[PDB]
Design a binder for these strands. Structure first.
Lengths: 106, 66, 117, 88, 70
RNA sequence: AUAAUGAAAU
RNA sequence: CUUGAGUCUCGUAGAGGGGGGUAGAAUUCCAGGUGUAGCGGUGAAAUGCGUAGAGAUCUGGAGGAAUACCGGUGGCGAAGGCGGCCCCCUGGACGAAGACUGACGCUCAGGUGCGAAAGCGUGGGGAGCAAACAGGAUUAGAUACCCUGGUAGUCCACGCCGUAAACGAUGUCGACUUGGAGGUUGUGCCCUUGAGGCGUGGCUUCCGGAGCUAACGCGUUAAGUCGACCGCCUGGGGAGUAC
């Protein structure tokens, strides 16, 4: 099992489905003997440049630990879902639990 | 030369820290050289990596006319 | 015609010629002038004076629209960057903005080869 | 490279004790394990010339150590190659 | 370079501000240097020559202040 | 901007 | 036997290699709106493009090649070489404190691998610019230098070829011999005055002492003082040519 940090962005006119999305992804990770170390929902933010003629995206952040296959399946889900417009997955050396700079000055 | 990261003993530069990253780009959006700001080479490399990540995630611009 | 009162000026300054185009705030042209068509040819076409005269003619050509406020956009390295702005101010418009929009790639296409003469 | 658990297991199996990390048997066994593992990698990436130098270095080192052991003690040499399945 | 003319601000000051901003950005240098293709050999040679000239000039000017001209 | 040539010896 | 040579435990910096995704700036092309006589190029010109509506300005779409700024006499690799961001597989180097094996080493004819650009074969792809080729010019002439076009190739998969001023024009390994100023990457202790001193390793740029050299110059990363193995030379052409 390895440690990952995930960020994803959602269409502003679909902000009502974010709780369901979070619940489903958390269940997928927990069913495979993994853990969740940080979860944060940043709300709607103004973009620095437009993406497909949009501004105002909805942001979610997670820090998790799990096997590789689960992460691959989650990536495929992001690819084929149309509410998600951009995402990023990165590897870390240790679990991170502290609070982010966006929940300290927003 | 004075390097704030060496002064404060930092480990990583944290692409999520926009307020800090803003001091190290010009008004066109370009990365400032190290010989102007006084940073060390190690932290200069880390800083460039962080800025590129933020540009991809749309927390910072690429240019001043998008 | 139709009144506007708020317009944009585009300046295309290359090493060989200068072009001035006045437009509304949506990109629709209203008039234009150039240095090569103002009575200059050859070694006199690429001077600041020719750019000055071209800007004066362009201002004259759009006097039926009644414009008051102007934005300015500049593109290119040639001689003609500043004389045109000065002439537009002297004609009697009020300048609100100045911006540079010269295109610069982030390492794209291969340029031509160097000249050996 | 190999993992800590696998290295410890091989050392326990082939050494005189859990601290005999530098015996000829232990060295040969570790090299054999890694050489066997990399066959899968190089059957998929046939044009990775830079990584193959390390593999060839491993092969050469094992050959030299086996020659030394054969010179110094024949019985141990026979037993070790029988246990590891090495011959052409 | 984006300039907004501030209230009460004349035109000449704005023009000078625009010029200074353009020079700081360095657009003319980029445009001039991108006009023709340059070979990697030439690029490397130019870099090394500039560095050597700077170093030699520094040494000469620092060691020339140890003599009297008259 | 371009723009050629001068036997052998003393 | 442990000092040469290796194995084990904890960390660190890196454009080291193979595979798959993705982002933003710019060139070209297609389809529309506004608008009207020029554009483009040179030392000066005209071949070319334009009232069948170009050049300029604004909106939508297609495609494939390279990654500004950071960026340095900076880093990694046996050499050739390697530069946007993310994931999978994978090779080498260095440091601190300990344990282990016990000369297990160095060099290498023949042999075997790797090896820039251009080139060859089979199947794909083709913005940009470019041998060949075609047309303005310049000239006594101009199969050239300059201008307007332009296909092979430059890109991808697999297989051939084996050469470069492939250069530090300096083979590999080990030991010894006064100094100064910098870069980059690890690590110990502390006067204690917590922002500063005093040490100890790897790699790397410049100046210079004795010695050496025909001179130019090299100088602890030697072209100085020594030891082990290998490759090569013997006046200029004819010739790295003929069989």
């Amino acid at each position: 099992m390895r440690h990952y940090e995930i960020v994803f962005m959602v269409h502003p006119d679909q902000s009502e489905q974010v709780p369901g999305m979070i619940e489903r992804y958390t269940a997928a990770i927990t069913g495979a003997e993994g853990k969740i170390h940080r979860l944060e929902d940043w709300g709607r933010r103004q973009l620095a440049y437009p993406i497909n003629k949009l501004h105002k995206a909805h942001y979610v952040l997670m820090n998790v630990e799990a096997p590789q296959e689960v992460i691959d399946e989650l990536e495929t889900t992001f690819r084929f879902n149309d509410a998600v417009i951009r995402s990023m997955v990165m590897r870390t050396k240790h679990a991170v639990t502290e609070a982010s700079p966006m929940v300290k000055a927003k | 030369k004075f390097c704030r990261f060496t002064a404060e003993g930092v480990q990583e530069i944290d692409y999520k820290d926009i307020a800090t990253l803003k001091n190290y780009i010009t008004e066109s959006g370009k990365i400032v050289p190290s010989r102007i700001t006084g940073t060390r080479a190690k932290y200069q490399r880390q800083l460039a990596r962080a800025i590129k990540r933020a540009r991809y995630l749309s927390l910072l611009p690429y240019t001043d006319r998008h | 015609r139709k009144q506007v009162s708020d317009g944009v000026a585009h300046i295309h300054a290359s090493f060989n010629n200068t072009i001035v185009t006045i437009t509304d705030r949506q990109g629709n042209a209203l008039g234009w002038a150039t240095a090569g068509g103002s009575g200059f040819r050859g070694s006199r076409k690429s001077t600041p004076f020719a750019a000055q005269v071209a800007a004066e003619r362009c201002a004259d050509a759009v006097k039926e629209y009644g414009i008051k406020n102007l934005e300015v956009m500049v593109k290119g390295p040639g001689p003609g960057r500043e004389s045109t702005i000065r002439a537009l101010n002297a004609a009697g418009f009020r300048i609100t903005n100045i911006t540079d929009v010269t295109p610069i790639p982030h390492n794209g296409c291969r340029p031509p080869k160097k000249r050996r003469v | 490279s190999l993992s800590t658990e696998a290295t410890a297991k091989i050392v326990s199996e082939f050494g005189r004790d859990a601290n005999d990390t530098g015996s000829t048997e232990v060295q040969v066994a570790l090299l054999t394990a890694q050489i066997n593992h990399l066959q899968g990698h190089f059957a998929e990436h046939k044009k990775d010339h830079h990584s193959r130098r390390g593999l060839l270095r491993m092969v050469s080192q094992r050959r030299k150590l086996l020659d030394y052991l054969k010179r110094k003690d024949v019985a141990r040499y026979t037993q070790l190659i029988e246990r590891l399945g090495l011959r052409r | 370079p984006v300039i907004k003319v501030r209230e009460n601000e004349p035109f000449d000051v704005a023009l000078r501000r625009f010029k200074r901003s353009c020079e700081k950005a360095g657009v003319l240098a980029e445009v001039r240097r991108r006009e023709f293709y340059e070979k990697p050999t030439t690029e490397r040679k130019r870099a090394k020559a500039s560095a050597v000239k700077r170093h030699a000039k520094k040494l000469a000017r620092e060691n020339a202040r140890r003599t009297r001209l008259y």
